[PDB]
């Protein structure tokens, strides 16, 4: 029931990422000379979070006060000195409440496998690509897939001649 | 009843992972020269979790205060010294409540078995593949299956000539 | 259901960013001599936040007072001196409450992949572009995409001859 | 009644594991040159569990406090010294409640018996397989069956010529 809807959601996301990669990889490598497939680890767990933050007021310069009683006594007779300080302070503090409801269906970790073809010249020899072109393909695929390191995304692009 | 629905859910997930692997393994190895099967250990246990986190306030620099009473007395007569400090502090602390309902049907551990064929040239000799090509197949299968180490995923790709 | 609406929202945003890039990249590079694709990481999490700020009043110059009792006693008999100061102060503080409801559907991180063609002169030789022109294209794409560093936007523009 | 439904559930699970093993064991060993049967020890016991976890706060660095009263007295007359420290602390602790309802019908222990045939060449001599091929079959069967050591899974693959 709901599981099938989630699976179809994942399939559509993967297909659209695949198409976005293919769109940029087509003009330079050529139609059919590139194949990519995407798998997506998604987030279907309902989470609700409330965050409370208090600004520190331990420093007297940023401390906000409402009432303060400072009783000071010094009975000098060091000799028979007698110092007494009774201090009472009531503070008002900065407060920030944030309520967050995470979206259901977010992407947790995306791994993408891309395979490119060789280059057959007018003679027909399948000449492999170069390192610079491979790096360009890797960068383009990283851009298309929305590659990020916090998610833990992995990308692998290899070059091999396609079968007949 | 519900068990059959869960089993069909597992079968669909396994079939889609299999198809995703086959899709990338087809262009280079060739149609029929690759077979893969997927088994999935799934999560059909309803879990509900509430998490509460308090930011530490043991350091006076990050401690937020509402009221503070500091009575200090020093009756010097070390001699007949008499020091007395009565300190009362009321704090306000950061608080974060997170409520999480894990999705039913998540994947716990995925193990995938892939078998590839040999290479029969124009003569017909079944020449086995190379180490580099095997490593490429392993990487592509890891990308397609969404291989992860936290889950405990295992992958095995072997090369052997297919039977008639 | 809602996930499909969110996905269509993302697709429309990406398509419009793509069209905006293409619009400026067309007059100089030429029709078809430029291809760009956009992926957008969006924000579909409902957040509500209330912020409270208190202006500090620890300095006597900016401190606002309602009532103040200052009892001062000095019984000089340093000799048998006896100083006593009982100070009670009630303050009024500046207060700023801000209530914010973040919009659903905002952009978190935008990464854009742009590919340009080579320059075929009247002879037909595919002459590559220059560094200055590449920098101009990068700047124009950054302007069109709304490039920002707080979001974490990444842009990659590469030059390569288009396939037939 | 319910027992028959559980038994049919076990039979379907065993049959699907058998088919998954046969699917990968077929292309290399050959159709009919492999037979496997699966038995499954299942879990039809309804379990409900609630877990409560408290983060330790014995270290003053990670201890979160709400109110703290520290009365310190030192009447020096070691001589007639008199030290007195009355400390009262109220803490707030991290709390995590997890409620888990285990699924009914999970697998406890899976043991699988697989038998393979010999190799009859063009002459017809039933040549036995090799150690490397046997290891490959064992690995493939382990992958297909979802072999795990926490469950206590056992696998046995033997080579013997099939009867007429």
């Amino acid at each position: 029931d709901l599981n099938d809807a989630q699976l179809k959601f994942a399939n559509d996301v993967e297909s659209r990422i695949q198409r976005r990669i293919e769109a940029i990889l087509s003009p330079i490598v050529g139609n059919g000379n590139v194949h990519a497939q995407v798998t997506a680890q998604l987030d279907f767990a309902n989470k609700e979070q409330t965050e409370e933050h208090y600004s520190p007021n331990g420093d007297a310069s940023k401390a906000t006060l409402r009432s303060r009683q400072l009783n000071i006594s010094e009975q000098v007779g060091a000799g028979p000195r007698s110092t007494q300080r009774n201090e009472t302070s009531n503070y008002e503090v900065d407060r920030t409440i944030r309520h967050t409801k995470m979206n259901v269906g977010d992407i947790e970790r995306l791994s993408v496998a891309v395979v490119v073809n060789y280059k057959t010249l007018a003679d027909g020899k399948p000449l492999p690509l170069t390192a610079d072109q491979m790096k360009q393909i890797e960068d383009l695929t990283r851009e298309a897939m929305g590659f990020s390191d916090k998610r833990g995304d992995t990308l692998n692009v290899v070059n091999s001649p396609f079968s007949a | 009843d519900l068990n059959d629905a869960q089993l069909k859910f597992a079968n669909d997930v396994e079939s889609r992972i299999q198809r995703r692997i086959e899709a990338i393994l087809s262009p280079i190895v060739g149609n029929g020269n690759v077979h893969a099967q997927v088994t999935a250990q799934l999560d059909f246990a309803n879990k509900e979790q509430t998490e509460e986190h308090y930011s530490p306030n043991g350091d006076a620099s990050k401690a937020t205060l509402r009221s503070r009473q500091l009575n200090i007395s020093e009756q010097v007569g070390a001699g007949p010294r008499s020091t007395q400090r009565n300190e009362t502090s009321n704090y306000e602390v950061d608080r974060t409540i997170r409520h999480t309902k894990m999705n039913v049907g998540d994947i716990e551990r995925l193990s995938v078995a892939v078998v590839v064929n040999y290479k029969t040239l124009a003569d017909g000799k079944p020449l086995p593949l190379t180490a580099d090509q095997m490593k490429q197949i392993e990487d592509l299968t890891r990308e397609a299956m969404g291989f992860s180490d936290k889950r405990g995923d295992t992958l095995n790709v072997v090369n052997s000539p297919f039977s008639a | 259901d809602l996930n499909d609406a969110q996905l269509k929202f993302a697709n429309d945003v990406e398509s419009r960013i793509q069209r905006r890039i293409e619009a400026i990249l067309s007059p100089i590079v030429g029709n078809g001599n430029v291809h760009a694709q956009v992926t957008a990481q969006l924000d579909f999490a409902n957040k509500e936040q209330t912020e409270e700020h208190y202006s500090p009043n620890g300095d006597a110059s900016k401190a606002t007072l309602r009532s103040r009792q200052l009892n001062i006693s000095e019984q000089v008999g340093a000799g048998p001196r006896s100083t006593q100061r009982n100070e009670t102060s009630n303050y009024e503080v500046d207060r700023t409450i801000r209530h914010t409801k973040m919009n659903v559907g905002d952009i978190e991180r935008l990464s854009v992949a742009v590919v340009v063609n080579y320059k075929t002169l009247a002879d037909g030789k595919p002459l590559p572009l220059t560094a200055d022109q590449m920098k101009q294209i990068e700047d124009l794409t950054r302007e069109a995409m709304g490039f920002s560093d707080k979001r974490g936007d990444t842009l990659n523009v590469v030059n390569s001859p288009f396939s037939a | 009644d319910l027992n028959d439904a559980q038994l049919k559930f076990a039979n379907d699970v065993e049959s699907r594991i058998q088919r998954r093993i046969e699917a990968i064991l077929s292309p290399i060993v050959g159709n009919g040159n492999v037979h496997a049967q699966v038995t499954a020890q299942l879990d039809f016991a309804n379990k409900e569990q609630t877990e409560e976890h408290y983060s330790p706060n014995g270290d003053a660095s990670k201890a979160t406090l709400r109110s703290r009263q520290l009365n310190i007295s030192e009447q020096v007359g070691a001589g007639p010294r008199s030290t007195q420290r009355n400390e009262t602390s109220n803490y707030e602790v991290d709390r995590t409640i997890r409620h888990t309802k285990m699924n009914v019908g999970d697998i406890e222990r899976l043991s699988v018996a697989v038998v393979v045939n010999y190799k009859t060449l063009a002459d017809g001599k039933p040549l036995p397989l090799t150690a490397d091929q046997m290891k490959q079959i064992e690995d493939l069967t382990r992958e297909a069956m979802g072999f795990s050591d926490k469950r206590g899974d056992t696998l046995n693959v033997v080579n013997s010529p099939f009867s007429a």
């Binding site: 309520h99 | 509430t50 409540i97 409520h99 | 409450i97 | -």
Partner: peptide, 19 residues
């Protein structure tokens, strides 16, 4: 209760909205 803590976070969200 787990549902009790859910209610606490709900009342915290209510306070947020009210502010």
């Amino acid at each position: 209760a787990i549902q009790g803590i859910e209610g606490v976070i709900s009342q915290l969200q209510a306070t947020a909205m009210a502010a």
